[PDB]
Amino acid sequence: MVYSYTEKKRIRKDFGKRPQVLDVPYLLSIQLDSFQKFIEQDPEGQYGLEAAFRSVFPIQSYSGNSELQYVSYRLGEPVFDVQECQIRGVTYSAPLRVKLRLVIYEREAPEGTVKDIKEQEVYMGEIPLMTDNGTFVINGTERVIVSQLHRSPGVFFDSDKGKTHSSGKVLYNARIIPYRGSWLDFEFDPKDNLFVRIDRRRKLPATIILRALNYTTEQILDLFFEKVIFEIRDNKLQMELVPERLRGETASFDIEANGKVYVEKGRRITARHIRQLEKDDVKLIEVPVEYIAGKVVAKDYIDESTGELICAANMELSLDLLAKLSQSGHKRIETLFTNDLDHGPYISETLRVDPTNDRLSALVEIYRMMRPGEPPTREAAESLFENLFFSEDRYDLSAVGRMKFNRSLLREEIEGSGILSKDDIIDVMKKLIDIRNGKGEVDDIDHLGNRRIRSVGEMAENQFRVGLVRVERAVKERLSLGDLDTLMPQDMINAKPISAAVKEFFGSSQLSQFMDQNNPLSEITHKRRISALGPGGLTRERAGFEVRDVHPTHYGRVCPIETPEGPNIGLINSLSVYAQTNEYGFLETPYRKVTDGVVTDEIHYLSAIEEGNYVIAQANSNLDEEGHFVEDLVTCRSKGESSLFSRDQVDYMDVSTQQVVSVGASLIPFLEHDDANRALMGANMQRQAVPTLRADKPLVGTGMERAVAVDSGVTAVAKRGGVVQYVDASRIVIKVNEDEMYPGEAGIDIYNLTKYTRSNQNTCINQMPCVSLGEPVERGDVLADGPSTDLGELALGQNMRVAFMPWNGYNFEDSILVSERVVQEDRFTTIHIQELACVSRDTKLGPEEITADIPNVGEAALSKLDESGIVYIGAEVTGGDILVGKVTPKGETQLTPEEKLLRAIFGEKASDVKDSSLRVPNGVSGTVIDVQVFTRDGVEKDKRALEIEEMQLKQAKKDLSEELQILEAGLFSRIRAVLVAGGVEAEKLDKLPRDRWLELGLTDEEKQNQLEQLAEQYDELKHEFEKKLEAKRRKITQGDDLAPGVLKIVKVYLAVKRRIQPGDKMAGRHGNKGVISKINPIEDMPYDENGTPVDIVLNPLGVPSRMNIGQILETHLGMAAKGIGDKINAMLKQQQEVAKLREFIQRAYDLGADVRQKVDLSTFSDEEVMRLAENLRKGMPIATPVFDGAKEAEIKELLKLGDLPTSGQIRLYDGRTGEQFERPVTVGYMYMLKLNHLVDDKMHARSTGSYSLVTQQPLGGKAQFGGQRFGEMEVWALEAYGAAYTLQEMLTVKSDDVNGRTKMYKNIVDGNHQMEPGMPESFNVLLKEIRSLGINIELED
């Protein structure tokens, strides 16, 4: 039994066969957790400000015996609030201050300090504080930073083969990507040669790095290569062979294994021969001599007598070499194997290519490649090389990079340094060689286990560290200079650089941007968006065909559907419902553990790596009561290959069908009946919705709408409240019960609604109350309803009656016919708020004042303007009427007898000012909602600016006096209680306080003393109230600061009511959209048998071409709900008994298969019955899961109870000819929504306006009455038509030909219709530009 006091008013019917196990999470933890942990005081330094400090904080002078340290950082409290910052337009940030410590040591003492300055902290800027809704108030405006997805730092063994080779061969390169520092990569040549490349520059020899890494040739050869003994003594030439160690190479001749011949001459080696030569112990066997020649010597040797470099390394053996080396050097020689069948040198080939064999010679080459000039001096090259990769302070990639490194190298250890190591590169090269020879599988860039996301916390920390190191450099400079001083710790500590850097990172960034405020769903999914571009990932939308392809590992991590259809397709994705971030950078997917068939309810989060190991079943499976399965074989995925498996093979279980779906797609019913593309466009355009005046609850639901509305933070919810005392249109106060009440507080919770506020999309946001009065409200219950919301459910759109029938071509392809009733019903009516602002801009000639004394204007225009020049609140305006009368002072003139005479006649103007008043742009009409004025301190004109301050102060005193009154009432009740039984009737206390007769002495020992104590309690409370009101007043009228050029700022907001009309972009929820083409009257449209006409006529041919069965299902459920609502409304009209309606609605609820158990008359009392019915008196709220919705038969019985035909087709009669139609038409009630693409905004045209200074062309894209632009492809089409005169008209009359435009205008006025070409000024500009170069050009005759 569910109470759901806030929801018990109206309960939506669900149809979920599977039972809910895990609830939907807060769905916004990712946005807030990163910020919280970044600003969190952690006991250990692992991230956030702590690690950013401990990175490079200790500052030491250049042998100055001085040091700089800190204790801890303290964040200052915000000066203003969210609403305060919004109104002021300031950025909501947080001050920061850290206690420091400067310690100096005198000379001639090892670490012997003499003084400390660990007594003064310093201040460093403000950190932009993040809101309660995962947002920021930067410059008053609200913006969202989208999380960035990129490849995790680590090593990548990529093939990079195919057609890109252009040689019919495969490639094998390795790439390492540090989180910071240069990029070191190694490419493979088609000549079987590796090459070192850094930062995509000129390649380098593979082995030059090893020589630079103090490695001799013999060391490298003995390490990477295996050497056979080659023990040839007394010219026996007897070779040690292990057939198991190496085999597969045919034997030519003279082959024996332990005496008798085991492998015949000219016969291929066989596994039998290998087996017998391994089983039979084989010693050094005489071989033919040519085997020496092909083999290469391992190490550079010397003769026994003389130490020459005879038989130097990387040299094949020679027969003439052979005898002399045998007689001089030795008899047994280290050599190689070079089993090209399974191996390949690939380095010994490159070894001879290397021109430098000394470490110094190799070290100069890398510096030369880095620096083309300024050759090193045995000091620059080594320092540069060490700082390049072996530097902790300059490479320092990450711990996650080391973890990925070890994981790729199968190392149990996961903790390492940020620097590299020689053995690391050695094993990387060896692994590359093994892979090239064949040892395993290649990596996968698109695999989600190889790519990680980034949150705002990590990037904020990176920005802070970048700003911090720059300042620390100057700090070290100032410590090394003039160190002999005991000044305060502010010698080089500047907050300006760090503050500017953090502001720029927050302010202007590719990832930083405003959110779409039109829809709460749009906001919440915008905060759940994921990208790959920006400072990393992908630099541009180009260079990718499969990167945007759907990897199989996107199963339960991101939505495979929610993505834009623009050129950024496949680059922006939304998280799944239950997706959670990994510890470092990845995503985790919860799953239910399956043990020996039964499924354990415990959840486990898995990555792309773990998921590919175990066995995970599909949610579309039958479960027994005990956790067993109806069928032994169930389809499961192991390594991306779904197939049936026995119940003993499954290892894990899904959570829900929505685990693969994002929030936006989850809200569309019957996804399994609609095309993927259709769902894609529907979800995309759903974000483009706009709320109307009356938000209407959808009748068909998915359940997640309630969670979306509550977690959106757009409405008001109840926190620790017990009962509502007073309700206002914008003010809400709830009295919490003593159970959830802690002492020391009054015990009242006030909430003020948002009323008609402009959004980032210039829309209107308003929060409507829900409860009536005196209603016991529980914690977590919604209190108000914002835009596109209804009773805690996101209600964006209206449920409109529709039909699928071609009506005279008005639904030809994508044209939508609308009802005059809807216009009369005012459905889809939109309200838009526009902002206009003005500034004074004090000049050299003088200040600019707003005194409403505008010359050369009539009093009629001035009628609507107030004394200071503003328009009265609530007034209406059309066209270009003046808003605020501002004037610009003019420089004085001489005596000017004409001007002197005019002033002696007219005066009060003397041409001292110019009309700089503020007026409406043309083609704009509306009314003013409110005005705002901002004046900087130091100027106190304030003609009528006191009114808004007075209103604010009245609001503050009103909502501050209430808690004081409540506490006073409690204290006075206490004092009335204490005078009881003291001989004092309550009548005296009721008449006057009198301080209870000023301690008359009811007890004379405690009554006097308790009365006194409570008297100072009252006095202290009075003082606290006075202090609070004074402080708030100071915070209100303190004034603001503006730009230095600006003097004062005035802002005005206006309301516009836009009504539906032909040309509006109208759409549904199934990837279906249309345009309004006609407002048909009600009478023309067809009507049913009962005379109720349809509302919307829609084309029935769209579905077959686009697979939109979900639309028809929506129609059938619409009839179900409409029949139920009409029946219950009729029952209500009849004024029947409670029991009949109760049993009727219980029947309406308990029906269907086993989905959910809920019964009335046990939880809901009588007094809830009529209100619950009146809630759902116009329809049945029905919820349908994403992939567990109702069935066709089910909706058939639904329609049966509705007294409706199961077919869904109903006869209609023409509204025009009054004739019955054959082929009865299915009708529908569609939860249709209006989009932002409204015709009044697209309304644009021009005849002739101002032109550009350059090229003398008209403005363009509607920028102050612009004009449309022509194109080259258009004139190609025109030339194919070949209307040359039209082309000349375009090029001359409507173009930059200044002398031609006026001529043509005068001709048209005179009706001449003659065209005078002239010659375009753009050509003149081109000619001048060519002549600006040293180029001769001229036009001949």
Binding site: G809, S1077, K1078, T1248, M1273
Partner: protein, 590 residues
């Protein structure tokens, strides 16, 4: 300096950028060097400033070629003189008719149900602004505007007489329209403007196919011809009434495919026999009886007298009375038919290709005006009957064959047998995979056959024979057969088993998708289905640009051609033969 305006950003600072900063640098460098040149500087120093001056000059000419000079606080380099010449932001840029248009901009597209082809619906909001100079001229001519300022004041006040004179001016004046993306010459057409109180224009539906519009969110531009010769070119060459056939291959561009086709198919049909089967009349009475009572368009075995007109005589037609039986709809449309065309040709199911041939033959024989007005009346009747027909759709329209489950059982049994014989070791992985593919393909084919058999002409109706399997009346079936909307492949995805749709990159999954949207879909099936849609969307988006680039290259390379000669008087040419390769001829010498 005029071509390089100061462009004050804040008003306080002009900040002349990308044009004068290079100039300033070079100027001060040259001044310093020339002043130093008179002071006998050391050779190294003066050579250094000479090198720096040469570098500055080169960057001023071509910054991108050598070195890198950036703007203040922006890593973006400066726009040099070549930069404003070549590239996508030079002067070879939108100066070749890429300039802005004074009289055009951002109109919205709606449906022109009425307002026949030689017209266009120009909302009054569009008017009274574009033709404003014409309004001023007419007002001055009519004596109602003594002064220009008075005319402007009256126009801004929007008087009724202003509307009257606007209507007078617009009456005999053509206008042209242009779809912004067009791949052919026919993207621009001229129409007669008509004022309707609204905000969006009504394009005639038949022309929308040429415009490639689809009535979704779309924008339109309008251009007004001013000179008389411009209007003459508009009415003789830009006019829709002249552009009927395709200039690419020769097919008639104007070809209805929407509700008109299905309405035509429906009006000309017969279940078995409607009310009044045996009635015989003249043919004008057909509508008389259908509208009132006694007859329905589905009536069969109806004879009438048809006076066919045939142009057998040279340039002359003769009448011919005929008494063939037909249906109600054909007799009704016969009045719409002009004289020249015969009746036996239109005595059929009258599908989409049928009406295409109707238009082709009517234009070929009669001419331009008759076929134009005939098409107008045809589309009028098509809308009238489509509204009349109703033509509903419902979950009961499509039928899932019952044998589908048995076919699935047999296919899965065969799959199990293949798996068993594979585990037996006689079959390899590739052979078994190919066999499974073939088995599933055969199952798909038989399912398609079964659903078509369920949907084809299998519908017994009461009659003296009581067994009359005539064409069913499934709306999907009519729209697929007539070809107005839908195809066999699409309906295969709707009633029966979906298919393979298995292509991650190039491979094919062994297990196909066995369902249809009517019965919902599996989570796994829906997940695996989206790959093809994603690939198709990506292909479209990435190939639009490639197609545009190819078209631009083609038009650039093939611009110089023009007809300046009549005859070459040459006997050299090309032998032309039919293409005969493979199984048969792919196209005749026709």
């Amino acid at each position: 300096p005029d071509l390089r305006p100061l462009v004050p950003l804040d008003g306080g600072r002009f900040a002349t950028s990308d044009l004068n900063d290079l100039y300033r640098r070079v100027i001060n460098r040259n001044n310093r060097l020339k002043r130093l040149l008179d002071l006998a500087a050391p050779d190294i120093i003066v050579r250094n400033e000479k090198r720096m001056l040469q570098e500055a000059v080169d960057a001023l000419l071509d910054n991108g070629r050598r070195g890198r000079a950036i703007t203040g606080s922006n890593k973006r380099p400066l726009k040099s003189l070549a930069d404003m010449i070549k590239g996508k932001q030079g002067r070879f840029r939108q100066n070749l008719l890429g300039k802005r248009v004074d009289y055009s901009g951002r109109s919205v597209i709606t449906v022109g149900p009425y307002l026949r082809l030689h017209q266009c619906g120009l909302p009054k909001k569009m008017a009274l602004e574009l033709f404003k100079p014409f309004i001023y001229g007419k007002l001055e001519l009519r004596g109602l505007a003594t002064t220009i300022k008075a005319a402007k004041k009256m126009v801004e006040r929007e008087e009724a007489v202003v509307w009257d004179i606007l209507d007078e001016v617009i009456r005999e004046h053509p206008v042209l329209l242009n779809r912004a993306p067009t791949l052919h010459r026919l993207g621009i057409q001229a129409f007669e403007p008509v004022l309707i109180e609204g905000k969006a224009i009504q394009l005639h539906p038949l022309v929308c196919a040429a415009y490639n519009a689809d009535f979704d969110g779309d924008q339109m531009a309008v251009h007004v011809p001013l000179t008389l010769e411009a209007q003459l070119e508009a009415r003789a060459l830009m006019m829709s009434t002249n552009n009927i056939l395709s200039p690419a291959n020769g097919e008639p561009i104007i070809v209805p495919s929407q509700d008109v086709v299905l309405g035509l198919y429906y009006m000309t049909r017969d279940c078995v026999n409607a009310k009044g089967e045996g009635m015989v009349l003249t043919g004008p009475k057909e509508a008389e009886r259908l509208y009132r009572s006694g007859l329905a368009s589905l009536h069969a075995r109806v004879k009438v007298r048809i006076t066919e007109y045939e142009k057998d005589a040279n340039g002359e037609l003769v009448a011919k009375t005929s008494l063939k039986d037909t249906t109600v709809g054909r007799a009704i449309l016969w009045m719409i038919v002009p004289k020249g065309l015969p009746y036996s040709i239109v005595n059929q199911a009258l599908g989409k290709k049928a009406i295409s041939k109707m238009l082709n033959t009517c234009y070929r024989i009669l001419g331009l005006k008759p076929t134009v007005i005939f098409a107008d009346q045809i589309m009028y009747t098509g809308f009238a009957y489509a509204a009349r027909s109703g033509a509903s759709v419902g979950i009961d329209d499509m039928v899932i064959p019952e044998k589908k489950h048995e076919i699935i059982s047999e296919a899965e049994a065969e799959v199990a047998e293949i798996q068993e014989q594979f585990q037996s070791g006689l079959v390899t992985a590739g052979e078994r995979y190919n066999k499974v593919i073939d088995i599933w393909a055969a199952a798909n084919d038989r399912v398609s056959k079964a659903m078509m058999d369920n949907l084809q002409t299998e519908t017994v109706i009461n009659r003296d024979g009581q067994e009359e399997k005539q064409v069913s009346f499934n709306s999907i079936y009519m729209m697929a057969d007539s070809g107005a909307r839908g195809s066999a492949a699409q309906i295969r995805q709707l009633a029966g088993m979906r298919g393979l749709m298995a292509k991650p990159d190039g491979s094919i999954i062994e297990t196909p998708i066995t369902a249809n949207f009517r019965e919902g879909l599996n989570v796994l099936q829906y997940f695996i289905s989206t790959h093809g849609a994603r690939k198709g969307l990506a292909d479209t988006a990435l190939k639009t640009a490639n197609s545009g680039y190819l078209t631009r290259r083609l038009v650039d390379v093939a611009q110089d051609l023009v007809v300046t000669e009549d005859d070459c008087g040459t006997h050299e040419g090309i032998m032309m033969t039919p293409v005969i390769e493979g199984g048969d001829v792919k196209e005749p010498l026709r």
